[PDB]
From a paper:
We crystallized DrPOMK kinase domain and determined its structure in complex with Mg/ADP, aluminum fluoride, and GalNAc-β3-GlcNAc-β4-Man at 2.0 Å resolution. DrPOMK kinase has a bilobal architecture characteristic of EPKs, and can be superimposed onto PKA with a rmsd (root-mean-square difference) of 3.1 Å over 222 aligned Cα atoms. The critical role of this Lys in DrPOMK is instead served by Lys91DrPOMK located at the beginning of strand β2 that reaches into the active site and interacts with the phosphate groups of ADP. Compared to PKA, the linkers between helices αE and αF are much longer in POMK, and the catalytic Asp (Asp202DrPOMK) is located in a MCD motif in POMK. In POMK, the MCD Cys (Cys201DrPOMK) forms a disulfide bridge with the Cys in the activation segment (Cys241DrPOMK). A DLD motif is present in POMKs, and the first Asp (Asp225DrPOMK) adopts a similar position as Asp184PKA. Gln212DrPOMK at the C-terminal end of αCL occupies the position of Asn171PKA, and functions as the second metal-binding residue. The trisaccharide is nestled in a groove next to the nucleotide-binding pocket. The most prominent interaction between the mannose residue and DrPOMK is seen between the Man-O6 hydroxyl group (the phosphoacceptor) and a carboxylate oxygen of Asp202DrPOMK, the catalytic Asp. The planar AlF3 group is sandwiched between the β-phosphate of ADP and the Man, and is 1.9 Å from both the ADP donor oxygen and Man-O6, mimicking the catalytic transition state.
On the other hand, protein O-mannose kinase (POMK, previously referred to as SgK196) is a carbohydrate kinase like Fam20B, and plays a critical role for the biosynthesis of functional α-dystroglycan (α-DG). The mannose is then phosphorylated by POMK at the C6 hydroxyl position, to allow further glycan elongation by enzymes including Fukutin, FKRP, TMEM5, B4GAT1, and LARGE. POMK mutations cause a spectrum of congenital and limb-girdle muscular dystrophies, including the most severe presentation known as the Walker-Warburg syndrome, which is associated with brain and eye abnormalities and death in early childhood. Despite compelling biochemical evidence in support of the kinase activity of POMK, its catalytic mechanism was puzzling, since it was long considered a pseudokinase.
Numbering used by the authors: 53 to 342
Write the structure that this text describes.
């Protein structure tokens, strides 16, 4: 489609984005398909087409919603969910409906043996490629370097991605996308203290027991925090599929670079993605001659 047109479902042609008037009328609410702190998502109908309708849950988080919509329009690409309509005045927008839900429910989807054949390594590794391909485009976005902040644990990280009906990974929940400027200082992912090993080590309070947490005193980090969580996401996406034991071997060294304690030594998302594509191709040639 042209830049701001869309063709979803059984559409024969692309339509320009729906604006506030047609959304209030032509978009009818059906079934809630997703909750969240920032949003409520309803499966909906617009002109015989199934669609996704995201509303602002609580007025408390109006700013997060509007910027997530601001970034959603800014980063419409092959790596992000397809936008359908925008009406920020009503704090609401419309995107393409993906019936497989989030990639959080991946193993349940591949359990359905209408999707058993796709429970292969070339599908799961492609999803990981799409994941790193998104992160590569994120850190080099037209809106400057951006950081996927809403990713403190593994499951919340997966909840921000969708599974298109052809086993492709798409980003969706872009409410928290700060920009890393080339000036310095960096960014922070929230106004409260983060903990755990799933977040990057620089995302932790570095002062210990004597100094209690304080938002102004947190130094600040960059996009390498996304590199940090790539193996844990990659480990989930491959699961234990036939062949993934060989793939993790090939990716061990690039796994070990993403998990470096010093962030400036971690590989860029384009460095990670290139290894992922080359391993995919190598095992595609290894399978061919058998
Ligand atoms: C309100 C605010 O602080 N927005 C800033 C924003 O913050 C993000 C933050 O970047 C990340 C920290 O990782 O976390 C966001 O909140 C998460 C939270 O981490 C958990 O995953 C989870 O928490 C809840 C809490 C309540 C509910 C409710 C009742 C209902 C429900 O169904 O789910 C939850 C889950 O989910 C939230 C959101 O996904 C935090 N965002 C929010 C809305 O709190 O970061 C940007 C730039 O990064 C600015 O700092 C914002 O000001
Ligand atoms: N287009 C969509 N198609 C199908 N499922 C969706 C779509 N958008 C959201 N979902 C579901 O809504 C959930 C919450 O979406 P999200 O953007 O992350 O809300 P929030 O910002 O409140 O956390 C997703 O994890 C997912 O299950
Ligand atoms: Mg979410
Ligand atoms: Mg959100």
């Amino acid at each position: 489609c042209p830049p701001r047109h869309f063709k979803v479902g059984t559409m024969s042609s692309c339509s320009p984005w729906l604006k506030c008037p047609e959304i209030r009328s032509g978009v009818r609410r059906v079934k809630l398909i997703g909750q969240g702190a920032v949003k409520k998502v309803y499966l909906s109908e617009w002109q015989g087409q199934k669609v996704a309708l995201s509303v602002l849950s609580s007025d408390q988080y109006a700013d997060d919603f509007l910027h997530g919509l601001s970034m959603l329009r800014a980063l419409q690409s092959s790596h992000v969910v397809t936008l359908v309509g925008v009406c920020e005045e009503d704090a609401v927008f419309v995107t393409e409906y993906h019936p497989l839900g989030s990639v959080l429910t991946l193993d349940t989807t591949l359990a359905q043996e209408r999707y058993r054949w796709r429970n292969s390594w070339h599908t799961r590794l492609q999803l990981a490629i799409d994941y790193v391909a998104f992160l590569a485009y994120l850190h080099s976005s037209p809106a400057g370097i951006r950081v996927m902040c809403d990713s403190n644990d593994l499951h919340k990280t997966l909840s921000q991605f969708l599974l298109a009906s052809d086993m492709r990974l798409l980003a969706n929940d872009l409410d928290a996308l700060p920009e890393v400027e080339k000036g310095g200082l960096g960014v922070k992912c929230g106004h409260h203290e983060l903990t755990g090993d799933f977040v990057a080590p620089e995302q932790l309070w570095p002062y210990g027991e004597d100094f209690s947490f304080s938002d102004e005193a947190m130094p600040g980090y960059d996009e390498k925090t996304d590199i940090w969580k790539i193996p844990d996401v990659t480990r989930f996406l491959l699961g234990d599929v036939l062949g993934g034991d060989v793939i993790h071997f090939h990716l061990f060294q690039i796994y070990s670079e993403c998990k470096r304690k010093e962030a400036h030594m971690r590989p860029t998302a384009r460095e990670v993605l290139s290894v992922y594509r080359s391993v995919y191709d190598s095992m595609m040639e290894s399978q061919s001659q058998r």
